[PDB]
A paper describes a structure:
Our previous attempts to solve the trimer structure via cryo-EM failed due to severe orientation bias and trimer instability. However, by complexing the trimer with K11 IgG, we were able to overcome these issues and obtain a 3.4 Å-resolution reconstruction of the complex. Of note, the SIVmac239 SOSIP trimer that we used contains a K180S substitution in the V2 loop to increase the binding affinity of the V2 apex-specific HIV-1 broadly neutralizing antibody (bnAb) PGT145, which enables its use in competition experiments. Our cryo-EM structure confirms that K11 targets the same glycan hole as ITS90.03, which is located in a position equivalent to the well-characterized 241/289 glycan hole on BG505 SOSIP. In addition to the absence of a glycan sequon at position 254, which has a PNGS in ~80% of other SIVmac sequences, another PNGS at N247 also sits within both the K11 and ITS90.03 epitopes and is almost completely unoccupied. The K11 epitope-paratope interactions are largely dominated by sidechain-backbone hydrogen bonds between the CDRH3 loop and gp120 residues, as well as hydrogen bonds with the unique SIVmac239 glycan at N37, which interacts with both the HC and LC. The K11 CDRH3 loop is 25 residues in length and features an interloop disulfide bond between residues C100C and C100K. The glycans at positions N284, N295, and N371 also surround the epitope but are not engaged directly. Although the ITS90.03 and K11 epitopes overlap extensively, the orientation of the two antibodies is orthogonal to one another, with K11 and ITS90.03 being oriented parallel and perpendicular to the viral membrane surface, respectively, which expands the binding footprint of ITS90.03 into the gp120-gp41 interface region. The containment of the epitope of K11 within gp120, as opposed to the epitope of ITS90.03, which also includes gp41, might result in more potent antibody neutralization, as the gp41 and the gp120-gp41 interface are more flexible than the gp120 core. The majority of the extended V1 loop is well resolved in our cryo-EM map except for the stretch between residues 127 and 139, which appears to extend upward away from the gp120 core.
Numbering used by the authors:
A (entry chain L): 1 to 94, 96 to 107
B (entry chain B), C (entry chain B), D (entry chain B): 533 to 674
E (entry chain H): 3 to 35, 35A, 35B, 36 to 52, 52A, 53 to 82, 82A, 82B, ...
F (entry chain A): 23 to 515
G (entry chain A): 212 to 264
The structure:
Amino acid sequence: DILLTQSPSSLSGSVGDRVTITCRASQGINSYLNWYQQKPGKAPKLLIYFANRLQSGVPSRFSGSGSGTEFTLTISSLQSEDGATYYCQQYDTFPTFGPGTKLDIK
Amino acid sequence: GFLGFLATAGSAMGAASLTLTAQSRTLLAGIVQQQQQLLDVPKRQQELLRLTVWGTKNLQTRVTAIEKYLKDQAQLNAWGCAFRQVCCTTVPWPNASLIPKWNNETWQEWERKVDFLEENITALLEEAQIQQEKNMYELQKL
Amino acid sequence: GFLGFLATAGSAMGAASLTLTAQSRTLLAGIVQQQQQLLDVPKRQQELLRLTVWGTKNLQTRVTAIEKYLKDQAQLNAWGCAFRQVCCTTVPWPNASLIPKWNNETWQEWERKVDFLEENITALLEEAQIQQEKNMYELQKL
Amino acid sequence: GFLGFLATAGSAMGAASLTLTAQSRTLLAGIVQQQQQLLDVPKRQQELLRLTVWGTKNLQTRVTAIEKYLKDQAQLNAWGCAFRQVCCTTVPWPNASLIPKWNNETWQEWERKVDFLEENITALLEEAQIQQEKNMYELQKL
Amino acid sequence: QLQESGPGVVRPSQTLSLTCAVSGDTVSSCCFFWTWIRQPPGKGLEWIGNISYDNDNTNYNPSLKTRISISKDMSKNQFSLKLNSLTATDTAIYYCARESPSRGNFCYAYLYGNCPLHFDLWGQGVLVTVSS
Amino acid sequence: TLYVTVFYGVPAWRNATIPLFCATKNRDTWGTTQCLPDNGDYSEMALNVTESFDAWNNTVTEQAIEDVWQLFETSIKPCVKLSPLCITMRCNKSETDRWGLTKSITTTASTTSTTASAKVDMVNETSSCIAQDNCTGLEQEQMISCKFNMTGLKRDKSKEYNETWYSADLVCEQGNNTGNESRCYMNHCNTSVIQESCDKHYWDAIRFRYCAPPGYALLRCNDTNYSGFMPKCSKVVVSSCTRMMETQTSTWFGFNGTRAENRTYIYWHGRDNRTIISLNKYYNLTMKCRRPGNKTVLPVTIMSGLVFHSQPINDRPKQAWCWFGGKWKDAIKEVKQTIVKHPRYTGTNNTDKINLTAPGGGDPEVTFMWTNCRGEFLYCKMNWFLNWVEDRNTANQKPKEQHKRNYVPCHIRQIINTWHKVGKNVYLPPREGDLTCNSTVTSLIANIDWIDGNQTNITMSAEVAELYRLELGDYKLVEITPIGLAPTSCKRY
Amino acid sequence: NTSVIQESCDKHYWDAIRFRYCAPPGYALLRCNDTNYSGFMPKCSKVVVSSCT
Ligand SMILES: *[C@@H]1O[C@H](CO)[C@@H](O[C@@H]2O[C@H](CO)[C@@H](O[C@@H]3O[C@H](CO[C@H]4O[C@H](CO[C@H]5O[C@H](CO)[C@@H](O)[C@H](O)[C@@H]5O)[C@@H](O)[C@H](O[C@H]5O[C@H](CO)[C@@H](O)[C@H](O)[C@@H]5O[C@H]5O[C@H](CO)[C@@H](O)[C@H](O)[C@@H]5O)[C@@H]4O)[C@@H](O)[C@H](O[C@H]4O[C@H](CO)[C@@H](O)[C@H](O)[C@@H]4O)[C@@H]3O)[C@H](O)[C@H]2NC(C)=O)[C@H](O)[C@H]1NC(C)=O
Ligand SMILES: *[C@@H]1O[C@H](CO)[C@@H](O[C@@H]2O[C@H](CO)[C@@H](O[C@@H]3O[C@H](CO[C@H]4O[C@H](CO[C@H]5O[C@H](CO)[C@@H](O)[C@H](O)[C@@H]5O)[C@@H](O)[C@H](O[C@H]5O[C@H](CO)[C@@H](O)[C@H](O)[C@@H]5O[C@H]5O[C@H](CO)[C@@H](O)[C@H](O)[C@@H]5O)[C@@H]4O)[C@@H](O)[C@H](O[C@H]4O[C@H](CO)[C@@H](O)[C@H](O)[C@@H]4O)[C@@H]3O)[C@H](O)[C@H]2NC(C)=O)[C@H](O)[C@H]1NC(C)=O
Ligand SMILES: *[C@@H]1O[C@H](CO)[C@@H](O[C@@H]2O[C@H](CO)[C@@H](O[C@@H]3O[C@H](CO[C@H]4O[C@H](CO)[C@@H](O)[C@H](O)[C@@H]4O)[C@@H](O)[C@H](O[C@H]4O[C@H](CO)[C@@H](O)[C@H](O)[C@@H]4O[C@H]4O[C@H](CO)[C@@H](O)[C@H](O)[C@@H]4O)[C@@H]3O)[C@H](O)[C@H]2NC(C)=O)[C@H](O)[C@H]1NC(C)=O
Ligand SMILES: *[C@@H]1O[C@H](CO)[C@@H](O[C@@H]2O[C@H](CO)[C@@H](O[C@@H]3O[C@H](CO[C@H]4O[C@H](CO)[C@@H](O)[C@H](O)[C@@H]4O)[C@@H](O)[C@H](O[C@H]4O[C@H](CO)[C@@H](O)[C@H](O)[C@@H]4O)[C@@H]3O)[C@H](O)[C@H]2NC(C)=O)[C@H](O)[C@H]1NC(C)=O
Ligand SMILES: *[C@@H]1O[C@H](CO[C@@H]2O[C@@H](C)[C@@H](O)[C@@H](O)[C@@H]2O)[C@@H](O[C@@H]2O[C@H](CO)[C@@H](O)[C@H](O)[C@H]2NC(C)=O)[C@H](O)[C@H]1NC(C)=O
Ligand SMILES: *[C@@H]1O[C@H](CO[C@@H]2O[C@@H](C)[C@@H](O)[C@@H](O)[C@@H]2O)[C@@H](O[C@@H]2O[C@H](CO)[C@@H](O)[C@H](O)[C@H]2NC(C)=O)[C@H](O)[C@H]1NC(C)=O
Ligand SMILES: *[C@@H]1O[C@H](CO)[C@@H](O[C@@H]2O[C@H](CO)[C@@H](O)[C@H](O)[C@H]2NC(C)=O)[C@H](O)[C@H]1NC(C)=O
Ligand SMILES: *[C@@H]1O[C@H](CO)[C@@H](O[C@@H]2O[C@H](CO)[C@@H](O)[C@H](O)[C@H]2NC(C)=O)[C@H](O)[C@H]1NC(C)=O
Ligand SMILES: *[C@@H]1O[C@H](CO)[C@@H](O)[C@H](O)[C@H]1NC(C)=O
Ligand SMILES: *[C@@H]1O[C@H](CO)[C@@H](O)[C@H](O)[C@H]1NC(C)=O
Ligand SMILES: *[C@@H]1O[C@H](CO)[C@@H](O)[C@H](O)[C@H]1NC(C)=O
Ligand SMILES: *[C@@H]1O[C@H](CO)[C@@H](O)[C@H](O)[C@H]1NC(C)=O
Ligand SMILES: *[C@@H]1O[C@H](CO)[C@@H](O)[C@H](O)[C@H]1NC(C)=O
Ligand SMILES: *[C@@H]1O[C@H](CO)[C@@H](O)[C@H](O)[C@H]1NC(C)=O
Ligand SMILES: *[C@@H]1O[C@H](CO)[C@@H](O)[C@H](O)[C@H]1NC(C)=O
Ligand SMILES: *[C@@H]1O[C@H](CO)[C@@H](O)[C@H](O)[C@H]1NC(C)=O
Ligand SMILES: *[C@@H]1O[C@H](CO)[C@@H](O)[C@H](O)[C@H]1NC(C)=O
Ligand SMILES: *[C@@H]1O[C@H](CO)[C@@H](O)[C@H](O)[C@H]1NC(C)=O
Ligand SMILES: *[C@@H]1O[C@H](CO)[C@@H](O)[C@H](O)[C@H]1NC(C)=O
Ligand SMILES: *[C@@H]1O[C@H](CO)[C@@H](O)[C@H](O)[C@H]1NC(C)=O
Ligand SMILES: *[C@@H]1O[C@H](CO)[C@@H](O)[C@H](O)[C@H]1NC(C)=O
């Protein structure tokens, strides 16, 4: 299978700053990578799909892109409501998910 | 002909099972069937054997079977280890960044990760064989 | 070219005298004479070298000389004993009902008594060589 | 392709440096470029691949590359020492009147002084190999 | 939309079942998959399996090849898990999702690797504890 | 420590772009000359590999298209040229006026009739209207009896000949003919030279399969989810030769396909909206075409000594026509459903908003169904059929086209602009006697084109070449390259 | 009238045409050198081998 990892595992920034998460893979993913946002006590929701498409209902502050073995999630202006664990999913084959990373709030 | 090469695909590199008789068998099956047809066409059409397109397309396929067989034998003799399986040549592997997972990866997956090394390696393998030959040349002369 | 193969026919299998250079000599005599003619025809007719029938019949004969030489070498390498005379392979003879009179029968008489065995034997000889190669593969790897 | 053979011309026979991979390399460079063109011509002209003169002249050059490679291998196997550099055959040199100045003469100058010996020598070299093969034939049989 | 359900406590060596109801939709709708993932406490998201797939075909995470079974029932608008040979490490929040394809010029087949696929719609999640 | 070493006999491959061998069973003419005999070995091995397949960008399909075309060209090349026939012919004026090649204002026709006249007419095997070639709505074949002066091998002697042309094959000079004997020429002569397709081409079936040369193999995608373009096929099967291909040419529907399965598949171009829809064999869809009458054929020797086959019928037979059998209504409903559920379709999910339609324009090359019946090409007008199979509310399609029938009127055309991208016109000799053909229907060739979530238009297409991409398509040609390199510790001495 | 007559213009039949056949490499011609050879002979005891006719 494809090993999907994430970095930084723990990062933060102030409300209003630019915060990014990078996902990497041991094998190339053609473009088949999704991003999810999970808050405590809740099921995760789709944030971005298929590398470059924002999921309808998700605020415009979220964006991302990627290919091959490197993908990025960007929040252009971190909100106080964005404290969450974010996860990458490769679905190039039998989806395995990455470990997730945490964005805290300052 | 048999296609026993492709038959083990997906088994991983280690224990993949390599067969050295496999190219001789694909060529031999080919030559016999094509020779039978070469003798069969003249039964009805001897004059137009190469004039028209079918005879030049078939010529390219017969030529390819021979040239391909010979390219493998010529490259192997340049390296010198034509019948040595693993060959055990003296050229070092280019870097530690490209080491196969002998028990996880398949030869099909692996070879596509070294396509950019083969261009430099082929020449190095030939050079190593050339120096070994030079050393023996001098021993035989003296 | 020489035809030293046929020259000993009728001498019996034992002491028949086998020659391993004989196919190289028939091919070499052929290639030189045909090459001289390839260069000679253009002196008067360069354009119609393959368009008309004579150039496609001669192509089939030149192709046959090459394909035949290579079929023998390919089959021998599949067996592996290309330059070993008797080869000394490990495949057992099919049955006791077909044993040659080494001092009475000629190779011409004998081979026609085993035409129905060769079909099974060729494959067995190749299989025996393949396993020997597999054993060496593992020794070289480990 | 490389032309490393001609590259050492003028260096004298001794220390001339002989390379055994050199014919494999000239053939391999040739086959790859010609194969690319065989597949490229049909992009615009598939029907007239051999009908017109260019396709018969190119056929003779492709055929020559193969026949030449095989003549060298066939002659070497007739002698038997295909991969032995100096080969160390048992045929005596014809006379003391033709001894090279190993440290003064070039292979180009030397070979032209033995053109009238090669005609007799080639046959003798083959005969010597044939008797060695006969001796081994009998050892393997008995 | 997706409401899961099942016993909060199951024992080791028993079989767990979880059934999810689909509300405002059905389980025979075209080009959707009914899937499940797990989230052991303190861990990330593990995909475990997939069945509307319009067919009886399934895809399972190979680590559970002999342990997990997924089925659907069109008379109930429900789909469910059956997980055998339970152990302590199977404690997790079990979640449902649709894994909807993005149909269009980028989707060739409803297979992994041949179509954009994403879990847009998620259920609530059921925490199942395996204990004595 | 770790040396490159050389591993010989390695199970690995790369994309090949080389010519393939053909092998066949019909060796009466073409097969012996160009092909090897069919070995009959259709077995395959499955491999545990993942591979990328494409039908519209392959070497296997692009040779099938070029090879069928090329074998056609080498068959007609030595046949009689008809430039000696591009002379004014003296044609019966009544028949030129009735079929509209020439004009007349002395016919002053006026018709009064019922406008509420649409009918529904069904035919099947057990019917006298088929046996007698008189189904409701069929007319006469449209043929202009013409005379001309032709010279044979004796040079200074000539004879007048009787030739009956289909109207589709004549031009006819117009203006100030106040008598009889109109002046006509062949439809495609003056811009070019028409050659007769004399060596029985299209009179029988051509079937063959391709075989890889030594060292090469064919991989095939054996999924059910294969839709022409598939970047990662998990079921890869390896063999040395392809399935047997039927080199049939037609528009709108493909006939006698090898890929006839109890399933509807739709292949789409990856970069386009063009598709080939296979039809479900479960419904036994069949087309039965007839050429009523009994033709006489008269060989004419022209100057060079080569022979032209004339058609002195001197009679007035009914139109060639086609009868559609099998469960067409249900097969078409499945096509609509298959499109709705397809991965590449994002249109309407309402099957009553998806319709079959003819391509537009006034160009006969796309608006008529073109089919081959043992050597004669037929061009069918299919409005009656489409209205029937869709159970369409006709209502306002002009009286003649407002019928629902499972048969269509058709006409014979002898001067044919061939199917490949050539612009070459050939003459198809008439067949002596009567003709009947009974073919299976295996595919629907169409583009799917929608712009909104209401109205999808399955537009019938004339791109006959794409039919070869359903026959093959799932194949990939690869080169076995069994030399590998890999770090290991085992250096010689 | 039934055909077209072509002139045999390239001096054909104006001189003698004589040639012999030669076997390609690996092949040979055997000849029956009996006096009892009558065209068909299933067992010729005098067999002679050569490369050309
Ligand atoms: C052995 O044989 C097999 C079988 O044939 C070979 O497999 C085929 O290999 C081809 C390349 O050799 C592949 O095609 C190429 O795909 C590229 C990627 O396409 C996708 O991304 C596009 C844009 O994405 C960018 O950004 C991301 C990150 O955000 C990066 O990762 C990307 O690299 C890019 O920078 C996207 O536009 C594509 O979608 C469009 O094209 C595909 C075509 O497959 C269509 O299916 C889609 O519907 C869509 O179509 C639009 O565009 C076409 C024009 O092509 C119009 O006709 C349509 O109407 C519509 O507008 C994908 O999502 C492409 O970038 C690449 O294109 C560039 O390069 C080619 C030359 O190679 C140029 O001609 C182009 O103009 C352009 O510059 C190309 O399409 C095949 O997909 C692959 N086939 C299969 C089945 O897998 C294999 O390689 C062979 N192997 C060997 C060793 O020989
Ligand atoms: C290398 O090249 C050489 C040189 O060409 C090859 O040698 C030739 O090989 C051929 C076979 O491959 C031989 O021909 C065959 O001979 C068979 C035996 O013929 C005799 O017996 C016939 C009947 O006997 C039956 O009963 C006895 C026991 O009682 C059995 O043992 C037999 O097997 C039978 O069952 C008898 O009729 C024959 O006599 C007739 O035929 C011969 C032809 O040689 C004539 O010479 C005779 O005059 C006589 O002619 C009559 O028939 C012919 C029709 O052929 C008419 O035209 C005449 O007017 C007249 O009526 C013999 O006494 C035959 O059975 C066999 O025929 C069958 O099979 C062939 C196909 O192979 C069919 O086409 C037939 O229709 C029939 O079914 C055939 O004739 C050649 O003799 C032999 N040539 C030489 C010089 O030796 C060699 O094989 C090649 N090797 C390789 C590896 O390629
Ligand atoms: C979709 O698929 C279908 C099914 O395969 C296909 O229909 C069939 O097409 C084939 C090929 O055209 C047809 O086969 C031919 O049929 C004719 C007619 O036979 C009937 O009528 C005669 C009347 O005399 C009866 O005696 C006979 O029993 C049948 O009822 C045959 O004449 C053809 O044979 C000729 O060629 C043979 C070669 O070996 C000769 O030995 C034989 O004597 C025949 O010679 C004639 O034709 C020669 C032309 O080369 C000519 O030179 C001779 O002088 C003489 O005229 C052959 O068997 C088959 O019947 C069709 N079946 C059906 C149900 O339609 C469709 O065509 C295909 N459609 C598309 C679009 O691809
Ligand atoms: C070869 O190819 C043929 C043609 O495709 C296949 O035949 C079809 O097989 C399928 C599967 O068995 C049939 O589908 C089933 O039809 C049943 C009957 O429904 C009738 O009535 C409804 C209205 O109520 C109509 O819409 C329908 O068209 C029929 O007239 C249904 O009761 C079945 O329902 C099941 O699935 C649904 C989900 O869609 C569930 O909700 C139900 O509870 C239930 O489980 C089903 O739809 C189809 O009708 C057959 N077609 C024909 C023409 O006969 C062959 O099977 C195939 N051969 C092989 C070997 O595969
Ligand atoms: C061929 O058709 C007849 C008549 O059926 C009618 O006309 C058809 C052209 C079409 O429009 C049908 O829908 C019409 O119903 C068939 O004969 C009938 O068969 C049914 C049983 O299915 C029977 O109840 C009727 O009484 C029959 N009618 C008559 C006049 O006898 C005939 O079976 C069809 N042939 C085949 C091979 O199916
Ligand atoms: C080949 O002939 C066509 C048609 O022939 C002419 O129109 C017929 C209706 C009839 O009256 C014939 O006797 C005529 O010779 C030519 O097509 C016409 O070209 C003219 C331009 O010169 C154009 O104005 C017309 O509309 C065209 N008519 C049609 C029906 O297409 C065509 O140009 C001729 N080609 C050559 C090389 O001469
Ligand atoms: C194609 O099918 C038709 C039937 O639709 C066949 O024609 C029948 O042939 C039999 C036997 O000669 C006659 O008894 C019937 O009367 C014919 N039916 C009709 C309507 O004429 C035809 O033979 C089949 N195939 C071909 C190639 O002709
Ligand atoms: C096949 O046709 C459809 C319908 O026109 C194309 O779908 C459109 O794609 C564009 C992007 O290129 C979108 O902005 C439109 O909204 C889509 N239209 C509809 C109705 O959904 C489709 O791209 C075409 N396929 C190819 C390969 O070109
Ligand atoms: C290939 O797949 C089959 C199941 O279809 C499996 O039994 C076999 O072990 C697999 N082989 C390899 C090398 O993965
Ligand atoms: C070193 O390894 C990288 C892979 O990380 C590869 O791209 C590069 O070509 C290698 N360099 C050499 C000399 O082999
Ligand atoms: C194969 O993958 C496993 C992880 O699943 C790893 O532990 C093992 O070392 C890998 N094998 C090789 C040869 O690298
Ligand atoms: C061949 O026949 C000759 C007589 O003509 C005889 O002297 C010779 O020994 C025979 N050779 C063999 C091998 O039988
Ligand atoms: C056994 O000997 C007979 C000869 O009597 C032969 O026909 C048969 O093919 C032989 N069987 C095997 C297996 O060699
Ligand atoms: C040769 O034949 C004789 C009988 O004449 C026999 O005694 C002898 O054993 C046979 N030779 C062989 C090798 O079988
Ligand atoms: C060839 O000539 C150059 C001078 O141009 C000289 O330096 C070199 O040593 C010469 N080599 C031989 C083999 O004579
Ligand atoms: C002996 O040497 C002379 C050169 O002086 C040469 O022409 C002749 O061919 C040689 N003879 C032999 C048998 O080599
Ligand atoms: C080279 O020539 C010199 C004379 O200039 C001579 O003394 C020497 O022996 C010659 N070398 C050889 C190998 O004969
Ligand atoms: C077909 O694929 C090849 C790559 O294998 C690409 O270079 C070529 O441009 C493609 N052809 C088309 C239809 O664009
Ligand atoms: C044409 O046919 C009629 C019979 O309908 C006959 O009288 C006339 O002579 C024929 N004309 C020619 C030129 O063959
Ligand atoms: C017909 O005749 C009139 C004169 O009465 C002339 O003006 C007209 O151009 C002629 N038309 C044709 C087509 O010849
Ligand atoms: C019809 O043709 C005849 C000659 O066969 C001629 O006499 C007659 O006048 C023509 N009809 C008309 C209206 O010109």
